Amino acid sequence: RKMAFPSGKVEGCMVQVTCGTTTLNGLWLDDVVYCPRHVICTFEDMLNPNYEDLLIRKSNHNFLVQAGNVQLRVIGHSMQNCVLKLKVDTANPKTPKYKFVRIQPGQTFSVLACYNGSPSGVYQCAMRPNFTIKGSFLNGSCGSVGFNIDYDCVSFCYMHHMELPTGVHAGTDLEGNFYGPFVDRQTAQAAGTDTTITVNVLAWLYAAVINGDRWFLNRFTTTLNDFNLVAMKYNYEPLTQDHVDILGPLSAQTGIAVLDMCASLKELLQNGMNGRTILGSALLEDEFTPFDVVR
Amino acid sequence: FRKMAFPSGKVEGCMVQVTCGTTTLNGLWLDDVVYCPRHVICTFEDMLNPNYEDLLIRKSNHNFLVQAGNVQLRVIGHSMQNCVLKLKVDTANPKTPKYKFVRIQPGQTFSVLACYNGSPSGVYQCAMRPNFTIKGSFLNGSCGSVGFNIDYDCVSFCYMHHMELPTGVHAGTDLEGNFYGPFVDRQTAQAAGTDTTITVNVLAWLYAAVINGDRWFLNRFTTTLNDFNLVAMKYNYEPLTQDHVDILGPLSAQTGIAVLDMCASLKELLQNGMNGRTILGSALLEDEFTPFDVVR
């Protein structure tokens, strides 16, 4: 199963931020609430917001921050890229051990979808090669965050800002820098063409070998370049030498050389599954990383 | 449309580690009682044919080591209720949520908090299969992991994990120790029955596809409960009941597609196949969303 991380450590950080008539979620860590800067927009500002002008007109008391039933007093504010940082007078007693990290396409994380500062659901995600997320976000979901948890340390990697016309989602890291070529502005924007994460499919095939299945193996091999020439005809990401190195330990563990597994994937794309499933799917799954597979 | 689990925090604060001799698993700590599978009192030899009454009479409180993180909880009483062991402990859990023990029906969904060594590892959303198994991911030491639903404030515990069947699917009990399915907590040959697809859930997920963008599968045709159920029997789909039709009413009202109309869509989807056409994204027809789930 594609598992999300247990969400408790993040649930204790979610709050509600309202400015004017706009309400969204904030992330309360220590004495700072992080939230998307378009909370300071009215709907007449969405098309062409001048955020520096909108923000200089705000005072601390314009920001209503609510953690459950308690209002938090905002005592300062600043803007870092596309996020607003609200200094509050109380440090969150539920702040976990945490860091901010920027992820790269192909990497996975869990999303805690929230509305009105209250958590609604959690699911596991991958950042697509085109820097979008295939999320489940509705109105009021901004400021929901993505995260990993390693040894009780929560690494925040994503904050939600918008939905693109194909139904996919775009946001920032926790320093307010967008993933991909998007802007927090309601103007015509489109996700680039989305490709399958090849190194993740290969890792997952290795996962199936470690488990019971071998039905999809074959006796062929391939050069790296012949693999890429074929796979790109199926909208698969090109496989780099870094990707090959990364699979090395799984190759070691199964005794199947990386380019032999590449030959298997080539044949799977050519043939489909013929009514079979790998692990539990009838799809070539690309939201498990090689790092995930060892764990 | 993602298959989302409930936020797990209220449950994470209840997970403890329970060790009896050389056997270690997970326990659920609520107020001053720890609940866990009774086979924790078994050696990896008792498991073959245990007499649980006998093994429990031979146990004392000092046979049970319970650990909530860094803290050892002192067991001051033990009893058994069906297939679960109840260890009364020194201390009430200060993190006990509002909670209820409930028994669910095949086809209903819940979230699982997978745990190892009393420590939560991950969370995911499940359905109780018609053959009463769970298609989970559970490894050695996962026993005592629980499944749950949350309504507002209240945690409804519905599943406790006990075993893995040879198909790689899973079987457990409700919180009162009653098994789901024709299984026993004994290491002997048992097998999952022939499974089926949860028809009312597929229909719900098609309504979600309509609510969302996808409408290609819609057609002018309709069917009967009787005609559909013989299509169902042929394809290992759970038979569709008049109660299923009724609870799909909200979605039939919301989208304008009557259930026997959507059944014609489902019937044709199960014969044309899907024509390399995708629905939400799935190649197959998803049956792990309830009508309730889709409404929410």
Ligand SMILES: CC(C)(C)[C@H](NC(=O)C(F)(F)F)C(=O)N1C[C@H]2[C@@H]([C@H]1C(=O)N[C@H](C=N)C[C@@H]1CCNC1=O)C2(C)C
């Ligand atoms: C989809 C919409 C056409 C409305 C617009 N999209 C584009 O402008 C784009 F196409 F360019 F991306 C859009 O998302 N926004 C408009 C406006 C913000 C944002 C927004 O409303 N954010 C949400 C947070 N509570 C969550 C969204 C709502 C629906 N589902 C989500 O995830 C800003 C980009 C400042």
Ligand SMILES: CC(C)(C)[C@H](NC(=O)C(F)(F)F)C(=O)N1C[C@H]2[C@@H]([C@H]1C(=O)N[C@H](C=N)C[C@@H]1CCNC1=O)C2(C)C
């Ligand atoms: C799979 C195994 C052959 C070991 C056996 N299965 C069957 O005996 C059956 F086929 F009959 F079901 C089985 O599960 N057990 C043997 C024995 C308990 C149990 C058990 O070890 N439970 C684990 C709890 N930590 C979780 C399991 C472990 C691996 N993955 C899981 O989920 C009892 C039924 C008393």
